[PDB]
Symmetry: D2
Subunit: 193 residues, 4 copies
């Protein structure tokens, strides 16, 4: 819980920089009771800006004071059935470019975002890039032929990938996909980790 994780972590950091309730309360313009209450799980209503200050006087970040994502696994694993996948339709330049079928995710590995992607367009000339993004990405061509584009949107490198091909795109590298010219559509599994 936000409150408890904060309550425990706040007390940790405070002690770490050798401050008592009194000393910390003083730098924040609060009373010793207030601080003590926080360390007792009563910080729940603290605003983001307020958390910002507490973190500041303690010369650290809000992150260092809040608990980890939390656990959502069942004895080590988490499962997702095909019919419970969130479906988000991606739009680029008012066109239906992609369709994101979101696969299993877990708070134990927040950076893991697996997807089954429906590549809707089939005109390489109309390919639309993203500005690259954080985290690496593993790709597997699930169906059809994928026409891949990466690098500089103005003068990019290309590759026509057949069903079963696998790629890796490093973080920050810009990319774009479309079905092979005229083939209608294609599908690929995209795994961000």
């Amino acid at each position: 819980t936000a409150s408890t994780g904060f309550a425990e972590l706040l007390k940790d950091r405070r002690e770490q920089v050798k401050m008592d309730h009194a000393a910390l309360a003083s730098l924040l313009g609060e009373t010793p009771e207030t601080v003590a209450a926080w360390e007792n799980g009563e910080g729940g209503e603290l605003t983001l800006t307020q958390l910002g200050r507490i973190a500041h006087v303690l010369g650290t970040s809000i992150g260092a004071l809040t608990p980890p994502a939390g656990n959502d696994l069942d004895d080590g694993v988490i499962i997702q059935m095909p019919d419970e996948r969130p479906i988000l339709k991606g739009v680029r330049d008012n066109v239906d470019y992609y369709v994101y079928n979101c696969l299993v995710r877990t708070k134990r590995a927040p950076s893991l975002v697996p997807l089954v992607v429906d590549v809707l367009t089939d005109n390489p000339d109309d390919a639309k890039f993203n500005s690259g993004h954080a985290g690496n990405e593993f790709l597997f061509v699930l169906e059809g032929e994928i026409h891949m584009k990466w690098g500089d949107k103005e003068n990019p490198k290309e590759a026509l990938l057949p069903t079963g091909a696998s790629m890796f795109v490093e973080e920050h590298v810009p990319h774009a996909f479309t079905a092979a010219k005229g083939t209608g559509s294609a599908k690929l599994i995209a795994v961000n980790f």
Copy 2:
């Protein structure tokens, strides 16, 4: 600024898990406008518990959604004059055990907590342990003789350290210090990193 860092990071995570304002608003029981406002630096008054939920539906931590500690350096460095050091008097079992003179700290390395410590007691038999702590610690005997105790409080290892000696205590390892028997007091520099 808490609000802006959050505003930027929220939009990052939302997009990362392929959600639009609508989709996210729905899982949270909020309106699309609200979410949009947040991504626009208006999340300042969000409570800790509320931040807890947003982090939860986005399968991540509050930390991943809040900005880093921030920068407080002057072209790479930060300086502290001897007369501006915070002074906290540590008490163990109602006795004045230590006196913490806090040295320079920086939000760029929150785990760095340097101290000039006044070891007040000089009776090894009355040594008082801490339950060990996170982070390693480098020590340098600034003055007098330090009588060091570490490990198991019931049956610990010991060492009489002269002025100029240097030690390293791994994280979680319990320790205690006092001036060499009868010598009155001693001083050591303690650096937690």
Copy 3:
């Protein structure tokens, strides 16, 4: 190159601990020239055990002294065509349990090991566990029905997963797969990251 990375990193560490060619040569029982030669890319023939000692006197690891995996990407990406996938047949208890079709890998993310796995057996009762392993694993059922087993081999949790289902198994968690009882075989994509 091993030699150059080592040559550059050795000089870094040596300076870091304030040692000159003379000082380092002395602790190792070598001549100043020898050390200088190493820092000049001539360490190529140094044995593992010898590297072990150099690392030791420099109070660090061989890893800290050798260069990173290296880059093997083409402007950010690496591609693998379906016909160039390595094929390793996994055997457990003298039976053909799995068939590993290895997908694209990259020295820029060594922990990334994607696979198309052929689940050969279809008798849950004959399921064979692994002792769990380092790194998390994302799974997607490519075909048929997969009968999953994880946790304690003696009394494990189970799940019958249909085509299109996706799972996540945390690191160190033991697991086993087989095709749904009697269905012959199944295929799943396994991504270790």
Copy 4:
């Protein structure tokens, strides 16, 4: 031990990328026995360049295949008496600029390099910079007055620090020290972490 750590780690990586002795031996131009021997602690005489290749075919680094620095602590701590400190005399432009008295170091925190530094010169005009370096640095003025210079060697920022002052210099930031003009010499404790 280099050999054993390598023997264990090699087997780990090999299995991780689904290769048997045969498969790995083949990519390296070795026999299955050879590889098996390595995994059995007999890799001791492998040269750096050879380790370089093994790492390469296994799409990773030598570091990932060699063991960590190792442990050198005595129940959590390591101690150094003042008379056993290594003494290195630093020279910049053929002048005796510094004198490094090396304090306790540990393979459990290789980046920790604490020093008692004798600042020999006392002419700010003759201050000599370093090109900055990896890792942050905590400083404490042990004696006299230190004249500090950091940033751009051509047009740097300055500070006259009295005994007891403490500073922090971020990694890569260039710096230089000398005793306050005419005061002869000064001493400071420098802790790289």
